[PDB]
Design a protein around this motif. Structure first.
Motif, PDB file in Angstrom:
ATOM      1  N   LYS A 180       0.861  -1.165   0.000  1.00 34.88           N
ATOM      2  CA  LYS A 180       0.000   0.000   0.000  1.00 34.88           C
ATOM      3  C   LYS A 180       0.902   1.220   0.000  1.00 34.88           C
ATOM      4  CE  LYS A 180      -2.002  -1.333   3.659  1.00 34.88           C
ATOM      5  NZ  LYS A 180      -1.160  -2.545   3.801  1.00 34.88           N
ATOM      6  N   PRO A 181       0.461   2.326  -0.595  1.00 33.56           N
ATOM      7  CA  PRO A 181       1.366   3.469  -0.779  1.00 33.56           C
ATOM      8  C   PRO A 181       1.870   3.994   0.552  1.00 33.56           C
ATOM      9  CG  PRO A 181      -0.895   4.104  -1.186  1.00 33.56           C
ATOM     10  CD  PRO A 181      -0.892   2.615  -1.090  1.00 33.56           C
ATOM     11  N   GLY A 182       3.196   4.053   0.685  1.00 28.20           N
ATOM     12  CA  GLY A 182       3.854   4.546   1.882  1.00 28.20           C
ATOM     13  C   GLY A 182       4.772   3.532   2.538  1.00 28.20           C
ATOM     14  N   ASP A 183       4.513   2.244   2.334  1.00 26.75           N
ATOM     15  CA  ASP A 183       5.297   1.206   2.989  1.00 26.75           C
ATOM     16  C   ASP A 183       6.730   1.168   2.457  1.00 26.75           C
ATOM     17  OD1 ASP A 183       6.462  -1.524   3.254  1.00 26.75           O
ATOM     18  OD2 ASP A 183       4.509  -2.261   3.798  1.00 26.75           O
ATOM     19  N   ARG A 184       7.021   1.921   1.392  1.00 26.93           N
ATOM     20  CA  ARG A 184       8.350   1.995   0.774  1.00 26.93           C
ATOM     21  C   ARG A 184       8.754   0.671   0.131  1.00 26.93           C
ATOM     22  NH1 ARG A 184      10.311   6.409   3.814  1.00 26.93           N
ATOM     23  NH2 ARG A 184      11.753   6.767   2.074  1.00 26.93           N
ATOM     24  N   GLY A 185       7.778  -0.054  -0.405  1.00 24.61           N
ATOM     25  CA  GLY A 185       8.066  -1.241  -1.183  1.00 24.61           C
ATOM     26  C   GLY A 185       8.265  -2.480  -0.343  1.00 24.61           C
ATOM     27  N   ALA A 186       7.493  -3.525  -0.633  1.00 23.26           N
ATOM     28  CA  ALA A 186       7.579  -4.736   0.167  1.00 23.26           C
ATOM     29  C   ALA A 186       7.429  -6.026  -0.630  1.00 23.26           C
ATOM     30  CB  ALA A 186       6.527  -4.697   1.270  1.00 23.26           C
ATOM     31  N   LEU A 187       7.389  -5.979  -1.957  1.00 25.50           N
ATOM     32  CA  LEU A 187       7.094  -7.160  -2.760  1.00 25.50           C
ATOM     33  C   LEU A 187       8.279  -7.546  -3.626  1.00 25.50           C
ATOM     34  CD1 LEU A 187       4.314  -8.609  -2.673  1.00 25.50           C
ATOM     35  CD2 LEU A 187       4.262  -6.244  -1.919  1.00 25.50           C
ATOM     36  N   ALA A 188       8.495  -8.854  -3.752  1.00 24.13           N
ATOM     37  CA  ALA A 188       9.449  -9.413  -4.703  1.00 24.13           C
ATOM     38  C   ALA A 188      10.852  -8.859  -4.504  1.00 24.13           C
ATOM     39  CB  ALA A 188       8.991  -9.180  -6.144  1.00 24.13           C
ATOM     40  N   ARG A 189      11.168  -8.428  -3.285  1.00 23.45           N
ATOM     41  CA  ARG A 189      12.478  -7.846  -3.045  1.00 23.45           C
ATOM     42  C   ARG A 189      13.590  -8.863  -3.211  1.00 23.45           C
ATOM     43  NH1 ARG A 189      12.870  -3.471   0.410  1.00 23.45           N
ATOM     44  NH2 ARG A 189      14.046  -4.639   1.987  1.00 23.45           N
ATOM     45  N   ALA A 190      13.285 -10.147  -3.076  1.00 21.46           N
ATOM     46  CA  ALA A 190      14.324 -11.160  -3.081  1.00 21.46           C
ATOM     47  C   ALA A 190      14.963 -11.271  -4.461  1.00 21.46           C
ATOM     48  CB  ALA A 190      13.760 -12.510  -2.650  1.00 21.46           C
ATOM     49  N   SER A 191      16.103 -11.949  -4.495  1.00 28.67           N
ATOM     50  CA  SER A 191      16.871 -12.076  -5.721  1.00 28.67           C
ATOM     51  C   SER A 191      16.114 -12.881  -6.766  1.00 28.67           C
ATOM     52  CB  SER A 191      18.206 -12.747  -5.425  1.00 28.67           C
ATOM     53  OG  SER A 191      18.017 -14.141  -5.279  1.00 28.67           O
ATOM     54  N   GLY A 192      16.227 -12.453  -8.019  1.00 29.28           N
ATOM     55  CA  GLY A 192      15.658 -13.209  -9.115  1.00 29.28           C
ATOM     56  C   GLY A 192      14.155 -13.304  -9.096  1.00 29.28           C
ATOM     57  N   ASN A 193      13.489 -12.468  -8.311  1.00 26.51           N
ATOM     58  CA  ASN A 193      12.042 -12.493  -8.199  1.00 26.51           C
ATOM     59  C   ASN A 193      11.455 -11.190  -8.705  1.00 26.51           C
ATOM     60  OD1 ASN A 193      11.697 -15.107  -7.088  1.00 26.51           O
ATOM     61  ND2 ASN A 193      12.450 -14.315  -5.130  1.00 26.51           N
ATOM     62  N   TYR A 194      10.264 -11.301  -9.270  1.00 25.90           N
ATOM     63  CA  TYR A 194       9.640 -10.192  -9.961  1.00 25.90           C
ATOM     64  C   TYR A 194       8.144 -10.429  -9.991  1.00 25.90           C
ATOM     65  CZ  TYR A 194       9.787 -13.678 -13.630  1.00 25.90           C
ATOM     66  OH  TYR A 194       9.659 -14.838 -14.355  1.00 25.90           O
ATOM     67  N   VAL A 195       7.394  -9.348 -10.043  1.00 26.24           N
ATOM     68  CA  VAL A 195       5.962  -9.438 -10.175  1.00 26.24           C
ATOM     69  C   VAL A 195       5.612  -9.215 -11.636  1.00 26.24           C
ATOM     70  CG1 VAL A 195       5.496  -8.761  -7.817  1.00 26.24           C
ATOM     71  CG2 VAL A 195       5.686  -7.023  -9.578  1.00 26.24           C
ATOM     72  N   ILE A 196       4.426  -9.664 -12.020  1.00 22.89           N
ATOM     73  CA  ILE A 196       3.919  -9.499 -13.373  1.00 22.89           C
ATOM     74  C   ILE A 196       2.582  -8.789 -13.286  1.00 22.89           C
ATOM     75  CG2 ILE A 196       3.235 -10.637 -15.490  1.00 22.89           C
ATOM     76  CD1 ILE A 196       6.166 -10.754 -14.925  1.00 22.89           C
ATOM     77  N   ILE A 197       2.402  -7.769 -14.117  1.00 25.12           N
ATOM     78  CA  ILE A 197       1.200  -6.949 -14.080  1.00 25.12           C
ATOM     79  C   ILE A 197       0.202  -7.572 -15.048  1.00 25.12           C
ATOM     80  CG2 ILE A 197       0.252  -4.659 -14.326  1.00 25.12           C
ATOM     81  CD1 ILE A 197       2.120  -5.076 -12.047  1.00 25.12           C
ATOM     82  N   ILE A 198      -0.734  -8.348 -14.508  1.00 26.16           N
ATOM     83  CA  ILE A 198      -1.643  -9.150 -15.313  1.00 26.16           C
ATOM     84  C   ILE A 198      -3.045  -8.584 -15.356  1.00 26.16           C
ATOM     85  CG2 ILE A 198      -0.265 -11.106 -14.610  1.00 26.16           C
ATOM     86  CD1 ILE A 198      -2.477 -12.085 -12.931  1.00 26.16           C
ATOM     87  N   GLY A 199      -3.286  -7.441 -14.728  1.00 23.80           N
ATOM     88  CA  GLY A 199      -4.601  -6.838 -14.766  1.00 23.80           C
ATOM     89  C   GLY A 199      -4.519  -5.367 -14.453  1.00 23.80           C
ATOM     90  N   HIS A 200      -5.475  -4.611 -14.980  1.00 27.46           N
ATOM     91  CA  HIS A 200      -5.594  -3.193 -14.684  1.00 27.46           C
ATOM     92  C   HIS A 200      -7.057  -2.879 -14.430  1.00 27.46           C
ATOM     93  CE1 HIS A 200      -3.497   0.920 -15.481  1.00 27.46           C
ATOM     94  NE2 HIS A 200      -4.238   0.937 -14.388  1.00 27.46           N
ATOM     95  N   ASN A 201      -7.330  -2.175 -13.337  1.00 26.23           N
ATOM     96  CA  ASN A 201      -8.695  -1.885 -12.903  1.00 26.23           C
ATOM     97  C   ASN A 201      -8.801  -0.401 -12.582  1.00 26.23           C
ATOM     98  OD1 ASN A 201      -9.775  -4.545 -13.090  1.00 26.23           O
ATOM     99  ND2 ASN A 201      -8.687  -5.080 -11.203  1.00 26.23           N
TER     100      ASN A 201
END
Lengths: 247, 230, 101, 121
Positions: free
Chosen positions: A118-139
């Motif tokens: 959520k905005p403000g947490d300064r980023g918390a997802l997929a931080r680990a090595s070789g990991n990434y998120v994929i943007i599969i939807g837009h709402n």
RNA sequence: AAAGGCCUGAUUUUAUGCAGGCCACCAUCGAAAGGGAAUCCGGUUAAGAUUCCGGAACCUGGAUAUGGAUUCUUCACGGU
RNA sequence: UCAAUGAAGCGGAGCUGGAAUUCAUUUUCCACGUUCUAGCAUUCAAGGUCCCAUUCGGGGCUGAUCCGGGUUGAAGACAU
């Protein structure tokens, strides 16, 4: 019965993270007026190998637009991030490798990493090595965005949240094994007081729920309910389906 | 002049350091200021009960003028002026033997809530004012219906400072004239009638009407947008 | 003697008007410090009957105290003793929340 | 109507005049007399054999002095006591709870002249 | 958390004023091996010495004056 | 209730340029000084403007839209 080892771990008496060499709170720069309308242009002065984190840190320099100083901040190095590379971040940041973008502006089907829950947490997802998120939807109508998450999860995220374009460096960080005890010893010394992990079966029955017995056998069921309580849920926890995967 | 040169400073996004605009909106107000502030905000956000917001429906400034004017005429007499007043009183009673009426009948604004109330159920109060921001408000919430139910002309007034200075005290939270001379009687009757136009006639609706619910700038503007498009 | 009138409105506690005022101070009181000199009594009627006379030398404090019961002061609720006293919750405080204040 | 212009989102403590103490009475009601004077810091020179040996060839004296005897204190103390300029003062704490001070005399003032007038050597 | 400590001008104890005003910081302790302002030598006692004596050094802080510098082109000059 | 912040630009109402058929009127309509580069951006900003008597200095206004003084966001009578 005395206190099981994992029960001691929650006390934080000795298993605190060995933060002597940790370069700092690796997180994203706070959301400010500059990014909230346009963008900002920083520089990666140089990159250092963080301790206890496979990802190198894309340590960046940002100019404070309010007081004349260079607000230092650290980024998690994506692939292709290099020193002397200007970094553009904000809702008007042109999408490119190593540039932080709010998830509203990024188009569908894009690789992103180091994402804010959520905005403000300064980023918390997929931080680990070789990991990434994929943007599969837009709402856009409800300011939401649907992602494919590294754990195969399908999160909905406020479209205001932001993540840095590119995949976290150190892909294949885990491919070759430690190959020896001392290797893992050095891996864990720097980060956790959690190694070795000694099997509960070999314990005397006081030490662990599974321990004891003339024959070195677990005895009771490994699977243990979520509803179980501290000191009982050690072993196999809430195992929806044990055995081999894909079967 | 070839030495005065115009170099506009770009304060745009990502440009040179911004100038120090007025950050008054962003002051970390000391917590007592904050908690004091939203108290008024919560005082208006919530559905205000009928006998509350019987305040904040008060007298106009112009009418309050002659209100405070005629009271200033009927200012009480502080103990300093009593010093000589008791001095001549004691002398006149002692040697002049003028009973105790050596002084004229005092004509001062009765003040203090228990004193004024006593004037009210005795119907001996000819006019009563109430400060509209007493803390806690409980002190006066019963007064309006108490005054109305027996026909004494009351008036809610804003600012206990005016009451305090017209009574030589700091605050009074209440005021009352029980005696008015004939010359000031006509002005008083004008005031009482025009105040009765404000509260006495309308009190029944105020007895039934609710209040509060004032949405803030963000809320009220946004609900207008939904109102605007729907 | 408005205190008599103030008393009989104060009896009707859950009444709508005092329910409103109660809803005002609940918000106001939390934000202020747990202990803080009240500038002046909020219930003058009860103030003058509990001993407070509005002269020099009296002060008023407003305090908040946790509701609920007093839990056992033993780690992990490991009661040691006969099973008559195993219980570590639903163990009530002998004084009232008044005297705690 | 009119509102001021502030510059800091942070509201520091507003500076405000401070008044120094204006006591009705002195706390101790009287200035205590000198806790450490000349005679109070100096107790008595030591004439052990070594000090006897050290005095003439060292141009120095030895001074039993209080635990509180500071070099700044003692330097002016001996100077004002024997009316003698002092080059430098050396001190230590003898293990029997006595601060020994090796005071050294300048070129003009020679220890024996200062020593003999005292009464010893 | 309303946490101020230095700014400096009133005229060389000088306003305890906006005035050439500022991080918005948050008490302190924790190393006799961590970092560290500066010392060495010779002699010397019954026992002390990088500490005493002698000699030669260096540093910190302070006030503080001469030389030399620079300056009528106001706060240096050589060298690609 | 949660989170953050040195609580910095939030909402509304605008101005400018854009394609629209109220033609421009927030009856539309989106953005309001930066994207080849390991530079720098700091003096209540320069200018422009007004006032003072201005000494050889200062002080206001645009520059930098204005109103709301809710720090912002999430959630929400759930949860705690």
């Amino acid at each position: 019965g005395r206190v099981i080892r994992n029960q001691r771990k929650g006390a934080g008496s000795i298993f605190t993270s060995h933060t002597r060499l940790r370069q700092g709170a690796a997180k994203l720069r706070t959301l400010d007026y500059a990014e909230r309308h346009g963008y900002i242009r920083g520089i990666v002065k140089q990159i250092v190998h963080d301790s206890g984190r496979g990802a190198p840190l894309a340590k960046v320099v940002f100019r404070d637009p309010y007081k004349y100083r260079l607000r230092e901040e650290i980024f998690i190095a994506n692939e292709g991030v290099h020193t002397g590379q200007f970094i553009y971040a904000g809702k008007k940041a042109s999408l490119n490798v190593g540039n932080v973008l709010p998830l509203g502006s990024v188009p569908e089907g894009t690789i992103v990493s180091n994402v804010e829950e959520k905005p403000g947490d300064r980023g918390a997802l997929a931080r680990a090595s070789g990991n990434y998120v994929i943007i599969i939807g837009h709402n856009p109508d409800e300011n939401k965005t649907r992602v494919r998450l590294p754990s195969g999860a399908k999160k909905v995220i406020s479209s205001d949240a932001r993540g840095v374009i590119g995949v976290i460096a150190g892909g294949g960080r885990v491919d070759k094994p430690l190959l020896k005890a001392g290797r893992a010893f050095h891996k864990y010394r720097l980060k956790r007081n959690s190694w070795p992990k000694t099997r509960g079966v070999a314990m005397n029955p006081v030490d662990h729920p599974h321990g004891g017995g003339n024959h070195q056998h677990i005895g009771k069921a490994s699977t243990i309910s979520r509803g179980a309580v501290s000191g009982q849920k050690a072993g196999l926890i809430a195992a929806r389906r044990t055995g081999l995967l894909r079967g | 002049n070839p030495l005065t040169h115009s170099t506009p400073k770009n304060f745009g996004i990502g440009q040179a350091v911004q100038p120090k605009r007025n950050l008054s909106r962003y002051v970390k107000w000391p917590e007592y200021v904050r908690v004091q502030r939203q108290k008024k905000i919560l005082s208006i956000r919530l559905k205000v009960p009928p006998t509350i917001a019987q305040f904040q429906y008060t007298l106009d400034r112009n009418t309050a003028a002659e209100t405070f004017k005629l009271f200033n005429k009927y200012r009480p007499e502080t103990a300093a002026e009593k010093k000589e007043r008791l001095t001549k009183e004691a002398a006149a009673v002692a040697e002049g033997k003028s009973k105790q009426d050596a002084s004229p009948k005092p004509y001062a604004v009765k003040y203090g809530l228990n004193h004024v109330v006593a004037l009210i159920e005795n119907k001996k109060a000819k006019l009563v004012l109430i400060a509209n921001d007493v803390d806690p408000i409980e002190l006066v919430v019963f007064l309006p219906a108490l005054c109305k139910k027996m026909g004494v002309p009351y008036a809610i007034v804003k600012g206990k400072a005016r009451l305090g200075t017209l009574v030589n005290q700091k605050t009074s939270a209440v005021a009352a004239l029980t005696e008015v001379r004939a010359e000031d009687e006509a002005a008083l009757a004008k005031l009482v009638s025009t105040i009765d136009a404000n509260f006495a006639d309308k009190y029944d609706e105020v007895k039934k009407h609710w209040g509060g619910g004032i949405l803030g700038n963000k809320a009220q503007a946004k609900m207008d947008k939904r109102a605007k498009n729907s | 003697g408005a205190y008599k009138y103030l008393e009989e409105l104060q009896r009707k506690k859950q009444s709508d008007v005092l329910r409103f005022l109660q809803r005002v101070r609940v918000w106001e009181y939390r934000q202020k410090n747990v202990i803080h000199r009240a500038a002046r009594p909020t219930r003058p009627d009860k103030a003058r009957r509990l001993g407070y006379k509005a002269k020099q030398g009296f002060v008023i404090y407003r305090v908040r105290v946790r509701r609920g019961n007093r839990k056992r002061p033993v780690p992990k609720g490991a009661t040691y003793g006969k099973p008559t006293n195993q219980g570590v919750n639903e163990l009530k405080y002998q004084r009232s929340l008044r005297a705690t204040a | 109507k009119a509102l001021k212009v502030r510059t800091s989102a942070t509201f520091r403590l507003p500076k405000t005049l401070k008044l120094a103490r204006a006591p009705k009475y002195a706390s101790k009601a009287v200035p205590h007399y000198n806790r450490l004077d000349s005679y109070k810091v100096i107790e008595q020179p030591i004439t052990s054999e070594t000090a006897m040996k050290k005095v003439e060839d060292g141009n120095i004296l030895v001074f039993q002095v209080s635990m509180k005897a500071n070099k700044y204190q003692i330097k002016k103390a001996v100077k004002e006591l024997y009316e003698v300029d002092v080059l430098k003062v050396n001190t230590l704490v003898r293990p029997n709870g006595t601060k020994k001070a090796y005071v050294r005399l300048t070129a003009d003032y020679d220890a024996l002249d200062i020593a003999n007038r005292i009464g010893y050597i």
